């Protein structure tokens, strides 16, 4: 139960705080991992979540991920 994405619009802390505030708890988030120098993002989600939940939240939060 883990996910691995990448936010091409990284390179900042304000974005991490915004995505962490939303992703910090998406009714099924184990741990939101982010990589600025690598421009990657690894998030763990439990059974009450889905990569469509972290996207709907992270995307609606103001972040982009392909």
Curated annotation (Swiss-Prot):
Ribosomal protein keyword on record: no
Signal peptide start and end residues: none
A GO BP entry: copper ion transport
Residues at which Cu cation binds: 12, 15
Keyword Disulfide bond: yes
Pfam family of the protein (one): HMA
CDD domains: HMA
Domain called HMA: residue spans: 1-66
Additional remark text: Copper (2+) binding can oxidyze the Cys residues at the metal-binding site, leading to the formation of a disulfide bond.
Protein name as it appears in the record: COP-associated protein
Species: Helicobacter pylori (strain ATCC 700392 / 26695)
């Amino acid at each position: 139960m883990k996910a691995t994405f990448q936010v091409p619009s990284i390179t900042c802390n304000h974005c991490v705080d915004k995505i962490e505030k939303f992703v910090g708890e998406i009714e099924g988030v184990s741990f939101i991992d982010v990589s600025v120098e690598k421009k990657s993002v690894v998030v763990e989600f439990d059974a009450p979540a889905t990569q469509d939940l972290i996207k709907e939240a992270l995307l609606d939060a103001g972040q982009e991920v392909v």
